[PDB]
Design a protein around this nucleic acid. Structure first.
Length: 110
DNA sequence: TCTTAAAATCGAAGTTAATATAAACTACATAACAGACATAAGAACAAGTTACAGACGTATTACATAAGAAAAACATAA
């Protein structure tokens, strides 16, 4: 099932591709970790998910354990490549002591 | 001017506490006493208002600590 974010971006959890409607010619390439994080965020529309729970769901299924700086770096790359605002709540933000939040709308293509 | 009648005086204090006999009836107007009512003064209960106090609740100020991000240094592979 393909998902649409904020009526602008399109992404699929199965092939890890990003398409911007403003520039449909340029496909945006994302890493597996950040793509899985964004898909986990999209699976729970617009409510807080824990850093601990999201981290353990993303990386223990991978079979290997990493430190918590990895999640922060992955989110930094996600915000940078999506060209989301540096600290304003436009698409993805961080809620301290509670976890991570998404603002972009969810539109399932199929 | 020589009798002769009036007039006046006669110690202080202290004490010193009443008497005491002797026409009737009628008519009228006025004052006084008693009862009741209304009025001015008074008291009690409740309400409005205007303010100040008392402790609680708000905003100004100075931070402790922990999560997140940037950066410098290090180890490793080409």
């Amino acid at each position: 099932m393909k998902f649409i974010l904020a009526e602008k971006f399109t992404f699929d959890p199965l092939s890890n591709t990003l398409i911007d409607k403003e520039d449909s010619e340029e496909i945006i390439r994302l890493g597996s970790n950040e793509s899985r994080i964004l898909w986990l965020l999209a699976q729970r529309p617009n409510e807080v998910i824990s850093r601990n729970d999201l981290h353990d769901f993303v990386w223990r299924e991978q079979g290997f354990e990493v430190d918590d700086s990895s999640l922060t770096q992955a989110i930094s790359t996600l915000r940078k490549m999506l060209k989301d605002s540096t600290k304003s709540p436009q698409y993805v933000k961080t809620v301290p002591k509670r976890g991570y939040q998404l603002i972009a709308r969810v539109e399932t293509v199929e």
